[PDB]
Structure formats: C-alpha cells, structure tokens
Amino acid sequence: DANLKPKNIERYELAYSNPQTIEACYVPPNVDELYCRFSLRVEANSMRPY
Amino acid sequence: YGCSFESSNPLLAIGSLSARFGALYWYQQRYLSDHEAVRDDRALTKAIGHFTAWPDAFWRELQQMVDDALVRQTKPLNHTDFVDVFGSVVADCRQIPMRNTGQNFILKNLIGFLTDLVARHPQCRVANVGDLLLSAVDAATLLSTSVEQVRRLHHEGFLPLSIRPASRNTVSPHRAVFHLRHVVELRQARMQSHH
C-alpha cells in the first residue's frame, strides 16, 4: 500500500498461482523455412494539395 | 512432606516434590472419574501400585485405542484429526508443570511410543496411521517449546503446511495442519539437548 504499509497478506496466500487465458503461435515441427510476403505501391502525390 | 527414597524402581518414586504432586493429580482425573466421595485416603492410596508396571502398561493403553479407533474409521486417514484417535492424551501432559523431557516422565513415555508407531508404518500409496494432522498447539507440546517458536520454524521452511487456507484469513492455533510423521522426524533431527 503506497510503499508504506506492506499489506496484511499471510505468508501462504502468495504461493498460489494466477491463472490466465492467452493466444500464442509456434512454428510446427520439421518445417525448414518460413515465408513472409507483402506488396507496396508508391504514388507521386505530394506535388499538389488534395 | 519429603521424598527420602532409595531403590526407586517405579517412575513415581523419584524427583522433586512438585513433580510428585503433579503425577497424582494426573492419575486422579484419568482413573478416579467416580464423583468425589471424600475417600481422600483410599482413593489415592492405589496410585503407587498402578505405576509399578508403567514402563510396560502405558503403551498398551495407547495401543488399545488405535485399534478401536481404526475400525470406526469414516474418512481416509490423511484428512483425519489427530485428536479423533487419541482423545487429547497430549494435552494432559501439560498438567505436570515442567517443560523438559528428563523430568516430566509422562511426556517422555508418550513420545517414546509415538516414535515407534511411526517407525513401523512407512509411507506408501494408501494413507495410514502417522499421517494424522496436528494443530499448532500440539506441535508446541511435543517439541517442548512455545507456540510462537513453531510459527518462526514454519516461516523458515523447516516444515511444510498441508491444508490450503482461504485468502484474507489466518490459520488459528486450534486448526489441525501438520502431519505426524513430519513432526516426529524433525524433533529427532534438530531438537535434542542435554535434558
């Protein structure tokens, strides 16, 4: 509590876990390489105010 | 009025007067349950004979109730309270006022017994006697030390806690929570003295 009083919590009460639900992503076994792709367009559009 | 004894074979025949008084008080509540009839002489007169085979009788009194308790079992033993089997025989050890084992001979024999009981019942898949739960005030008595010392001993990790309490709560001294075999072993391991 505001780095002042440490809270009343009994010793055993912090040995408990905190469960959570998460999403995650891993490369599956035996894949040799991963690919990533995207496209890019460029326009000469700074010459004049929209 | 004095002691003055020699060839004191019985466990009631040695010691300071305060102990000799305490031993009689204990005998009386435990075996003279009959209501006072001011048989002040006769009622107590028998206590000396009683103790003459003590080193070999006390254990049988304790053994008898292990078996009678067992056949009335309703829960697996590892959630059973120590008290449900032995009926507070431990608390009675507090009627003699001395704390150390070499003088309080009633406590000395009770511990002897419990050590042997654990020794013949090692851990396996199904729970058995020896896994019973003790409360904080009980370990204090068996370990010959005050209660606050047990809390300190827990805090340093010298012994495990078996029941998970709820949050924002506290475990009171009367709650049953340590296994018997854990207390017996710890005492042999690090609580001995010249007493």
| Chain-chain contact of B165 with A10 (C-beta, under 8 angstroms) | yes
Using DSSP's 3-state secondary structure scheme, residue B176 falls into strand
Using DSSP's 3-state secondary structure scheme, residue A14 falls into helix
| Chain-chain contact of A12 with B169 (C-beta, under 8 angstroms) | no
Q: Which long-range contacts (CB under 8 A, 24 or more apart) does B148-155 make?
A: B155/A11
Residue B120 C-alpha from the chain's centroid: 18
- The number of beta carbons lying within 10 Å of the beta carbon of residue A13 is 16
The first and second tokens of residue B117, run together, are 């009981």
Distance CA B131, CA B127 (A): 7
Specify the resolution in Å.
Answer: 4.0
Kindly state the DSSP code that residue A36 receives in the 8-state scheme. -
Kindly state the DSSP code that residue A20 receives in the 8-state scheme. -
What was the experiment behind these coordinates?
cryo-EM
Give me Rg for the CA atoms of chain B.
Answer: 19
Q: Which residues of B touch A10 (CB under 8 A)?
A: 165, 169-171
Interface of A with B in 1-50 (CB under 8 A): 8, 10-13, 16
